[PDB]
Amino acid sequence: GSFTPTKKEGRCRLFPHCPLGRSCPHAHPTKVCNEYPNCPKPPGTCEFLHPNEDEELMKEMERTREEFQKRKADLLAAKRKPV
Ligand SMILES: [Zn+2]
């Protein structure tokens, strides 16, 4: 932990599982970084994605995407059949 009066260095913490992705004040990483691997941001502060540090974050994004795909597969398999 820590006891300093300092504010956040970037990056949202509930993400990808955050409901305010429209008006939330903290950075949702939804794009691959312009300057990776050369980035001065420590792991868990950059506005973008890094296919080495934030590689587990890309896995968490795929996890919620395949969950949402399974929810859409159930919708198209109701009053209708999959094909
Ligand atoms: Zn957020």
Ligand SMILES: [Zn+2]
């Ligand atoms: Zn970066």
